[PDB]
Design a binder for these strands. Structure first.
Ligand SMILES: [Zn+2]
Ligand SMILES: [Zn+2]
Ligand SMILES: [Zn+2]
Lengths: 84, 559, 263, 141, 159, 114, 65, 102, 196, 133, 43
DNA sequence: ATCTCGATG
RNA sequence: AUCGAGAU
């Protein structure tokens, strides 16, 4: 189907699962010399870069949350709130 | 079942385990040979190369090196043979299977795996010797003990998979469990027998010990706190320095039976901002309890704070105790001469109780309790009589054991043992039972061939009068034998009957999961629960509070 | 003299029961530790085996010879094998012995340490003699032979220390007790009725005062006076054991102090 | 000479066995309070008396020092593990070539013994050593 | 039995009461009697509860009994868990065993029921009926070695 | 097998210096000295004589783990005094006591018979 | 299997006292406890070493070649 | 929005009970600033406590009973393991039937 | 370990000095924890230890023969006649520091067993290696550099946590992983890699 | 920089509650018949017994690392023998017309009860306690 | 070796139970754990 | 009812 | 591959 930018209910907060793999999939790209959109106050490890790429919401991914019928809702990692 | 849903797999290990207290909770002592063998594929990058090449150089036999290197073409460079193995200029966009190192994420499990908790991500710390070492206070979830228990360890291969381990699976995340909405990790054995005796009012610690203890705590702020006592000789209380291990913004209030903001039993617990004010610290406070110091510190300060907490509590109490010491003799099961006299006769009065009911019953006077045989109401009367006899002999003993009796000292900590354990050691052991009832007549109308037939007395039907101290008699022994055969049997029959339960329970629920609409449904989209747990709330984030709208006077609701 | 103070009482070829007065417990301990584990000694750290027809296995026998007590009086003018510039041994850092015995008789032929045979040029220094305190003259029972069995060996003693392996203990057993009556209250005695009919009274209560019951706790009291007894094995006579310990202890304090000098 | 009889389970049904012969049939006529509490003589009938009771026990358990002052399933545990105890399994180990065989260096007869250790040749062919043991919290390792 | 109940004045207090405990079951006829309270009367036969008072009462015994199993040992387990279990058992309309009869004939894709007690048969009558497996189930995405609709794999990742 | 050779207890490896000194960041006028290939025999005797001196605020040691032959001494001292000395003075204080003793024993040894 | 040179726990030589010990029991007709004390074994760890060490060697020698 | 009102219900009954006027001011003497903190705090603290979509409760609820199930071992009732066995079998053939009438 | 079903693994080895010592100079060969004594009621263990002390001392055989008029008392009385306290305690000194231990300690010869099951016979570790012919899974058993089974049950645990990708990785890139071709119509392993 | 409370008490009971190094004391004040005290005390360091007369002060000084001595040459409010330092934790209206404070000296607790102690026993961390002669 | 000569095996109401009449003939303690507990006995 | 070992056609 | 013996 689709769904609009509106009419979204789907927790605006981030699941730990969401975060997990966003971190994970970023950590990956970093670990394969793909560019870093932060400044490294002095870190090497791919994950702990991704962690800092995230907390200054400079990560350019979009979650696609499926609903059980067959629809879904899109969510940039700018919108989602990292509490936890 | 065997090859698709449960394979055998690469990059795994297994060893004996043993407990190590100078090792943080979320850590795993990996022995060195294993880390010399297992490997994670790292990808060359500006960030790493310098370290990274030094590995390749080192070679696959001095610890922090590596085996194989893999290139554009995917060709495998074998660092252990190969002419070119002291060479190799690392070219960005390659990989380098490397020795597992300090601070890597790994899945450390014990079988049987009947939890999430039986599988957790740990933090590697490579060490000599050949034992997966671990922290005492990660015992319960795994269900381990160090009498030869063996444990598997799995190693992630993907950057994402590493994340999955450190972010979802990690030991400090699992502390506060959803299962029983309480913490699953506590403070056990030496640590705990000590978290307490350190604590007594009576326990005083003078300057020289204090200073090592303070230091012993890693987080220590480097500020000798002012001693309670300054007068004659400036002393510190047990409590006092243990307070250091406790972080700040930590508040805890207990109250047990005789407790009063004066606590003349040094009862309960009062703690205001990482400071212990009165009360002995024992299992109720610092076990895997619900009101628990650990339930608090976790939710309040964070998972990683409570994780280091454990270490610090340990390190100080483990030290102090090491210099104070503790033991256990057979003297700790002996008890006062006149008490053994009182205990004996306390049994004796119950042996006439039963005698009398036997003699009563023999004259058809015994009346039947509505809906059971005279014989079942004879048996019932008797069994009770000697259960109440054991207990009372026991309680009689629970009293001689003085506040220094090492058995009792562990008992008061909640570290090991129970009343029953005292009862049977010092007092009488008690009645033996098979299939619920006292000892059968396997022979004709008699228990053994040392008895006359038709003998329903205690002795004859499996009452062990002596203690594990004095020692059992031939008969007692043999009945006692029958006792814990039945025991051993259904033990290893409980373990199968159950291993099947946990398989079907699992296989039916399995695919259920809260979807992104906070409903709760299976593979077909068929709804089960419209909100998870009926409030859409994770169990871990939940605790026993009181609803003081419910109870008390209409007056004092209004007062 | 000045601080730390001795009063020998009993004295033997292997026993030195003394009172050690005016010291920190700290050092009474650190002396005892060193005395066990840190004064150097000669013992056999390389057996080179020609023929062994014995009941016992090679590396078993090897073990035992290692544990054989050897003279170590002039040890401190022998070098560690690691420190000498030679390839493997020399006579400058090792002392080699040989064992030959062969079942000859019918009636069980014994092999004592007494049959160990110096070979290497001693340089005329007191070193690497199988120590014998046996009365009938034969040290340790190495192993037993039958009618037709051989032992043909080559021992190579090296300098070493307990820390490395306990064959280099010169030490055996150190007695050590302070404050006979619990005047300082460094223990809390475990009791059934009377704390004092139940624990006994060490000979060491004789050379100290009772407490005149009424008196309160001596609160700012510390420990002087430590009743010791160093039992030597034989490698070194007893005097030297306490001595070289005091020495070696001093010597590794030195190295730190002098290691700030270097830094 | 008829001083002894071979009794089976079935015939055991029709008899009365005495446990001790001593304290169980002299004339009836103080009690060191730490001794255990054996029952009485309440029987006059006895046809044949038990040789000695520690013969209800089998090979393994007869190795245990004081199994009477011991919870019953413990004894059972030990009686599986004495069969995993390292020691001299035979004098002639030196001449027998079997897949795997362990022997202890300095085998040591125990200090605490059972009267049925004599017939079980356990002091002659020990397994295990006589260690000075200390019950204490020390390093907490 | 012992009961905690309101006093007129507000306090909860001990009104001790008189209950009868049976050995045998015919709910059908004992609640219809005089002098009992038909609003309370309880059987440990949650199976007899259901056929009488409908599914939604049945559930709430099934639970209550599962609870008394765990609780009588001291152990506490947070509701939701046992609730879910009970909820799953009781939603097809009937009571549905946690054995191959209840939960393994239940419509599911085939590969799932495969990974359990009657393997081959289920593959056969899947074959003949021409079942279409969804590939939404845990067990099935494990067989084919793919990312499971689970925590990490429930969502999708994009740009 | 994973056992390390014993000598690693009292023999220094490569680029491993008996003392490594760093400045404790938490306190002031304070110091943490690592002692490679040494154990309680040394650390405990150093601490005690570090505490008798009356211009010392604090001192303590700890063998971070009993597999390894290391140990960490932490000293804090008076406004003025630099711990290196407080350590120096200490070490010597000790050496004398021992020299005193070594003599004093040797004296009372010689007077006895047998 | 031959006396164990030096007692495990304590460290004092004892391998040199075996033949001597057997001679004190069998010959001057003494109880092991006195014999043990006579041979300078006063602690009990050092004592238990002689009072136990069982001399299996006397049985393997028994075999021929 | 009616499920919402009904998932929150019990929490508020608490919230209001531990937030009554008398109590806020008299029992635990709060101040505007601290009170408005306590207010903002709970909200966050609640929100965090929600279930995260992805949670595989299916398994989790099984394990959480299946575990303490393996930890049971030893006034006439079928109880422990054998009862559990009964229960989950949906026993028609059951051993301790009992009516309990008030 | 011991003789009354009280087993144990070694956790650590200390050198004689670091061991706590008795004033007579003795040190313990082996230290057990007092926390495995209340809950298995292994009283004999204790009694053996007391008996065995006396007997080592007096140089007499320990009679622990089962049914007997031997008594904890009957022994203790003798242990005293010899100079040590009658319940096997001795005052000990933490050898680290020298200082007396605050508690007194149960100390005695106790017959211990060495058991089979040593570590360096168990310490298998695999990091990829040989695979079976049929399945192309890693082989059973350390005896041929085999794998470790990531069983059905350990799967359940990775599902619980929510770790999907790790599940894949464990169940694919380690162990079996294999690419096949498939018809985009008659959906079957019927195809034909004339790959090249 | 000053004192907070002062009085001479007399002890009635001396209670060792399964303890050999502390006794908790119930003592009463000469002077004002609306006042009494409760005090957990190290009775090995500074003994105490039947119908005794003890003096008491609170104070708030003579907070960084505790230096010691160098103070055989210094200020010390130590004209007193026994002396502790605690945190204070509750101020109990006995109701009235009367008020009780609660101090903790590392688990050695303290109760007090009067009514001028108002503008005089603050609400505070500071609380030394000095007990002479 | 002695024990394993003096062993008993039983294939397959309630036979694992130590039974009264075992007194004297079969050992009440000696038996393996789980698997085949109480089916296997020693004399 | 996760592991090690031996044996066997 | 069949098979028994063990660690939990
Ligand atoms: Zn040389
Ligand atoms: Zn010895
Ligand atoms: Zn096709």
């Amino acid at each position: 189907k689709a769904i609009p930018k509106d009419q979204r209910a789907t927790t605006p907060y981030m699941t730990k699962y969401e975060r997990a793999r966003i971190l994970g999939t970023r950590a990956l790209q970093i670990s394969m010399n793909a560019p870093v959109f932060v400044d490294l106050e002095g870190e090497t490890d791919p994950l702990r870069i991704a962690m800092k790429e995230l907390a200054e919401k400079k990560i350019p991914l979009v979650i696609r949350r499926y609903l059980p019928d067959g629809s879904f809702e899109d969510w940039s990692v700018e919108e989602l709130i990292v509490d936890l | 079942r065997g090859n698709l849903m449960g394979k055998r797999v690469d990059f795994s290990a297994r060893t004996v385990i043993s407990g190590d207290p100078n090792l943080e909770l979320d850590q795993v002592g990996v022995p060195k040979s294993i880390a010399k063998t297992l490997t994670y594929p790292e990808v060359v990058t500006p960030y790493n190369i310098d370290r990274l090449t030094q590995l390749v150089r080192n070679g696959p036999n001095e610890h922090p090196g590596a085996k194989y290197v893999i290139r554009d073409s995917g060709d495998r460079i074998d660092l252990r043979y190969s002419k070119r193995a002291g060479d190799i200029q690392l070219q960005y966009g390659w990989k380098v299977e490397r020795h597992i190192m300090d601070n890597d994420p790994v899945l450390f499990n014990r079988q049987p795996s009947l939890h999430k908790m039986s599988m957790m991500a740990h933090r590697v710390k490579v060490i000599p010797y050949s034992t997966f070492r671990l922290n005492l206070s990660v015992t319960s979830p795994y269900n381990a003990d160090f009498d030869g228990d063996e444990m598997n360890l799995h190693v992630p291969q993907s950057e994402e998979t590493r994340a999955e381990l450190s972010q979802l699976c990690a030991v400090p995340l699992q502390i506060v469990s959803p299962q029983s909405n309480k913490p699953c990790m506590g403070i056990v054995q030496d640590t705990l027998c000590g978290i307490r005796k350190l604590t007594l009012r009576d326990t005083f610690i003078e300057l020289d010990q204090v200073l090592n203890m303070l230091y012993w705590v890693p987080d220590w702020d480097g500020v000798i706190p002012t001693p309670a006592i300054i007068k004659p000789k400036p002393l510190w209380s047990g409590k006092q320095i243990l307070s250091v291990a406790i972080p700040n913004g930590i508040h805890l209030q207990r109250f047990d039976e005789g407790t009063t903001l004066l606590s003349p039993k040094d009862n309960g617990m009062l703690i205001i901002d990482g400071q212990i004010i009165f009360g002995v610290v024992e299992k109720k406070t610092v076990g895997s309890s619900n009101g628990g110091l650990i339930h608090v510190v976790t939710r309040e300060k964070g998972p990683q704070v409570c994780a280091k907490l454990f270490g610090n509590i340990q390190k100080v109490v483990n030290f102090w105790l090491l210099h104070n010491g503790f033991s256990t003799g057979i003297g700790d099961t002996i008890a006062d001469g006149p008490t053994m006299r009182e205990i004996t006769e306390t049994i004796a009065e119950a042996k006439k109780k039963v005698l009398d009911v036997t003699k009563e019953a023999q004259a058809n006077l015994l009346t039947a309790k509505h809906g059971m045989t005279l014989r079942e109401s004879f048996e019932d009367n008797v069994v009770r009589f000697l259960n109440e006899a054991r207990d009372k002999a026991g309680r009689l003993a629970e009293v001689n054991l003085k506040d220094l009796n090492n058995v009792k000292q562990m008992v008061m900590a909640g570290s090991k043992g129970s009343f029953i354990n005292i009862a049977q050691m010092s007092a009488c052991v008690g009645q033996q039972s098979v299939e619920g009832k006292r000892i059968a007549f396997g022979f004709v109308d008699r228990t053994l061939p040392h008895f006359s037939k038709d003998d329903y007395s205690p002795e004859s039907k499996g009452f062990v009068e002596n203690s594990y101290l004095r020692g059992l008699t031939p008969q007692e022994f043999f009945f006692h034998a029958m006792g814990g055969r039945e025991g051993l049997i259904d033990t290893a029959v409980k373990t199968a009957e159950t291993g099947y339960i946990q398989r079907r329970l699992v296989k039916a629920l399995e695919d259920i999961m809260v979807h992104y609409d906070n409903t709760t449904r299976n593979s077909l989209g068929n709804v089960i629960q419209f909100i998870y747990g009926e409030d859409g709330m994770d169990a871990a984030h939940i605790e026993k509070q009181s609803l003081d709208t419910i109870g008390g006077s209409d007056a004092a609701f209004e007062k | 003299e000045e601080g730390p103070q001795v009063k020998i009482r009993e004295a033997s070829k292997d026993n030195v029961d003394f009172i050690l007065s005016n010291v920190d417990l700290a050092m009474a301990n650190s002396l005892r530790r060193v005395m066990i584990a840190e004064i150097p000694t000669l013992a056999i750290d390389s057996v080179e085996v020609e023929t062994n027809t014995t009941v016992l296995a090679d590396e078993f026998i090897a073990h035992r010879l290692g544990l054989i007590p050897l003279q170590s009086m002039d040890i401190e003018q022998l070098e560690y094998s690691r420190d000498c510039f030679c390839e493997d041994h020399c006579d400058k850092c090792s002392v080699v012995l040989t064992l030959q015995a062969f079942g000859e008789s019918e009636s069980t032929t014994n092999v004592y340490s007494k049959d160990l045979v110096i070979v290497s040029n001693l340089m005329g220094r007191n070193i690497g003699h199988p120590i014998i305190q046996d009365k009938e003259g034969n040290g340790v029972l190495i192993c037993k032979l039958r009618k037709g069995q051989e032992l043909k060996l080559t021992c190579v003693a090296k300098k070493g220390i307990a820390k490395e392996h306990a064959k280099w203990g010169p030490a055996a057993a150190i007695e050590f007790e302070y404050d006979p009556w619990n005047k300082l209250k460094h223990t809390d005695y475990w009791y059934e009725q009377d704390s004092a009919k139940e624990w006994p009274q060490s000979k060491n209560c004789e050379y100290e005062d009772p407490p005149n019951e009424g008196d309160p706790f001596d609160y700012k009291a510390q420990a002087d006076t430590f009743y010791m007894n160093v039992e030597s094995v034989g490698s070194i006579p007893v005097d030297q054991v306490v001595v070289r310990g005091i020495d070696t202890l001093q010597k590794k304090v030195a190295s730190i102090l002098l290691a700030l000098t270097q830094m | 000479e008829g001083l002894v009889e071979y009794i089976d389970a079935e015939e055991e049904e029709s008899i009365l066995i005495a446990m001790q012969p001593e304290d169980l049939e002299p004339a009836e006529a103080d009690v060191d309070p730490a001794k255990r509490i054996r029952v009485s003589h309440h029987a006059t009938t006895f046809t044949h008396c038990e040789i000695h009771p520690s013969m209800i026990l089998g090979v393994a358990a007869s190795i245990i020092p004081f199994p009477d002052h011991n919870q019953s399933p413990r004894n059972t545990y030990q009686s599986a593990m004495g069969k995993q105890a390292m020691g001299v399994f035979l004098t002639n180990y030196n001449v027998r070539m079997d897949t795997m065989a362990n022997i202890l260096y300095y085998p040591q007869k125990p200090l605490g013994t059972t009267r049925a250790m004599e017939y079980l040749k356990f002091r002659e062919l020990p397994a295990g050593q006589n260690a000075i043991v200390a019950i204490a919290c020390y390093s907490g390792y | 039995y012992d009961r905690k109940v309101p006093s007129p004045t507000g306090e909860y207090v001990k009104e001790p009461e008189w209950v009868l405990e049976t050995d045998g079951v015919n709910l059908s006829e004992v609640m219809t009697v005089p002098g009992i309270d038909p609003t309370r009367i309880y059987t440990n036969s949650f199976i007899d509860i259901m056929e009488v008072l409908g599914i939604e009462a049945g559930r709430a015994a099934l639970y209550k009994e599962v609870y008394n199993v765990i609780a009588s040992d001291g152990s506490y387990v947070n509701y939701r868990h046992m609730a879910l279990l009970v909820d799953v058992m009781t939603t097809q309309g009937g009571l549905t065993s946690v054995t191959r009869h209840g939960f393994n004939r239940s419509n599911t894709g085939a590969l799932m029921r495969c990974s359990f007690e009657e393997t081959v048969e289920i593959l056969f009558e899947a074959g003949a009926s021409a079942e279409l497996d969804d590939c939404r189930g845990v067990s099935e995405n494990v067989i084919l070695g793919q990312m499971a609709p689970i925590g990490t794999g429930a969502f999708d990742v994009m740009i | 097998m994973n056992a390390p050779d014993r000598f690693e207890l009292f023999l220094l490896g490569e680029g491993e210096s008996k003392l490594k000194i760093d400045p404790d960041t938490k306190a002031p006028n304070a110091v943490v000295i690592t002692f490679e290939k040494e154990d309680h025999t040394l650390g405990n005797l150093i601490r005690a004589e570090l505490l008798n001196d009356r211009k010392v605020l604090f001192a303590a040691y700890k063998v971070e783990h009993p597999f390894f032959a290391r140990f960490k001494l932490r000293i804090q001292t008076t406004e003025g005094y630099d711990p290196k000395d407080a350590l120096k003075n200490a070490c010597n204080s000790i050496i004398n006591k021992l020299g005193a003793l070594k003599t004093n024993f040797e004296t009372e040894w010689n007077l006895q018979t047998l | 299997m031959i006396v164990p040179v030096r007692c495990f726990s304590c460290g004092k030589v004892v391998g040199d006292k075996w033949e001597s010990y057997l001679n004190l029991l069998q010959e001057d007709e003494l109880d092991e406890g006195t014999a043990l004390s006579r041979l300078g074994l006063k602690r009990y760890c050092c004592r238990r070493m002689i009072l136990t060490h069982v001399d299996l060697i006397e049985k393997f020698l028994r075999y021929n070649p | 929005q009616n499920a919402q009102r009904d998932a929150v219900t019990l929490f508020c009954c608490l919230l209001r009970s531990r937030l009554a006027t008398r109590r806020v001011l008299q029992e635990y003497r709060l101040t505007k600033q601290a009170f408005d903190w306590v207010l903002s705090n709970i909200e966050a603290q609640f929100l965090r406590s929600v279930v995260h979509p992805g949670e595989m409760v299916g398994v989790l609820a099984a394990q959480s009973i299946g575990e303490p199930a393996t930890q049971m071992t030893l006034k006439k009732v079928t109880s422990g393991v054998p009862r559990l066995k009964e229960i989950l079998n949906v026993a028609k053939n059951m051993k301790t039937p009992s009516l309990t009438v008030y | 370990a011991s003789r009354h079903g009280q087993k144990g693994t070694i956790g650590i080895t200390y050198r004689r000095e670091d061991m706590p010592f008795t004033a007579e100079g003795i040190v313990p060969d082996l230290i057990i924890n007092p926390h495995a004594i209340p809950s298995r009621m292994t009283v004999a263990h204790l009694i053996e230890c007391l008996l065995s002390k006396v007997a080592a001392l007096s140089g007499n055989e320990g009679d622990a023969s089962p049914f007997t008029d031997i008594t904890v008392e009957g022994i203790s009385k003798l242990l005293r006649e010899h100079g040590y306290q009658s319940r096997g305690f001795e005052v000990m000194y933490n050898g680290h520091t020298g200082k007396k231990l605050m508690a007194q300690i149960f100390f005695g010869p106790t017959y211990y067993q060495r058991l089979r099951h040593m570590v360096d016979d168990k310490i298998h570790a695999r990091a990829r290696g040989p695979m079976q012919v049929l399945t192309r899974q890693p082989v059973e058993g350390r005896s041929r550099d085999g794998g470790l089974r990531f069983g059905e049950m350990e799967r359940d645990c990775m599902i619980a946590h929510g770790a999907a990708s790790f599940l894949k990785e464990r169940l694919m890139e380690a162990s079996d992983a294999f690419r096949v071709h498939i018809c985009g119509i008659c959906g079957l392993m019927t195809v034909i890699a004339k790959l090249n | 920089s000053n004192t907070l409370f002062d009085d001479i008490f007399q002890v009635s009971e001396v209670d060792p509650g399964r303890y050999n190094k502390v006794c908790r004391i119930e003592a009463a004040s000469t002077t004002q018949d609306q006042c009494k005290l409760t005090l957990d005390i190290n009775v090995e360091l500074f003994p105490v017994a039947a119908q005794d007369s003890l003096t008491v002060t609170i104070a708030s000084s003579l907070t960084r690392s505790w230096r010691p001595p160098q103070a055989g040459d210094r200020s010390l409010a130590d004209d007193y023998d026994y002396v502790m330092y605690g945190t204070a934790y509750k101020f109990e209206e006995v109701s009235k017309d009367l008020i009780a404070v609660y101090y903790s000296f590392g688990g050695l607790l303290m109760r007090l009860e009067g009514n001028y102690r108002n503008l005089n026993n603050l609400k505070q961390e500071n609380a030394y306690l000095l007990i002479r002669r | 070796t002695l024990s394993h000569l003096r062993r008993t095996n039983t294939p397959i109401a309630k036979p694992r139970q130590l039974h009264n009449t075992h007194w004297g003939l079969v050992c009440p303690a000696e038996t393996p754990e789980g698997q085949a507990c109480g089916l296997v006995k020693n004399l």
